[PDB]
């Protein structure tokens, strides 16, 4: 209901996790667990590919249609692109439906 | 100058005549050469066919271009379609120029 696609078996969904390194221990031993540990964090690069099937348009309209565009007149900055702060914006919600066909 | 292309043999022009049917002559032979006919007109169908070449547009730019859309609000007609009187207009010229290239 919030659109979308529904699926039975979605794509899975993946856990990550850093490996607990204690700290160094008493020399006698204690068999409470182990409380004490290195802080510790990690990066790194992630990839994800997607492969779309495409329903191509076939319409015999003779007008032109209605199309998403960008405005044509002068502005401080670009849509989509970074401000002078090099912050990130989308300035609207773009949505799919454009082309027609009959019902 | 006009703009188009510029061809050294362009598509042949194509020329197309009734030909003339003479009225009943005098029975005593005349040298002149004959002025009376009778009035004819033709119509007929008419194809023609044209393969173009595209050149595809492959892009790295961000943010989205600019297109050719029709108006979105209400109006009184349809642009290009025929009116109450079936009349076909064309309400604006339209150029060839929206998608952007790096100079
Ligand atoms: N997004 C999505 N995910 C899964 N199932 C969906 C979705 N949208 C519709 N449906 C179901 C609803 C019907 O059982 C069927 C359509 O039947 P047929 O006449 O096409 O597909
Ligand atoms: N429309 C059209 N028809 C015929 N010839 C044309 C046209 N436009 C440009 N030209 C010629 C002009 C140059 O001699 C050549 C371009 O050289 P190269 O560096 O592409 O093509």
Do not use: C
């Amino acid at each position: 209901l919030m659109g979308g696609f529904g699926l039975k078996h979605p794509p899975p969904q993946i856990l990550i996790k850093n490996t607990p390194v204690p700290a160094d221990p008493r020399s006698t031993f204690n068999g409470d667990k182990l409380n004490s540990f290195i802080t510790q964090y990690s990066t790194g690069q992630v990839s994800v590919e997607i492969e779309w099937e495409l329903q191509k348009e076939n319409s015999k309209r003779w007008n032109p249609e209605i199309q998403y565009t960008s405005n044509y007149y002068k502005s401080t900055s670009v849509d989509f692109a970074v401000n002078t702060e090099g912050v990130y914006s989308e300035p609207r919600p773009i949505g799919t439906r454009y082309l027609t066909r009959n019902l």
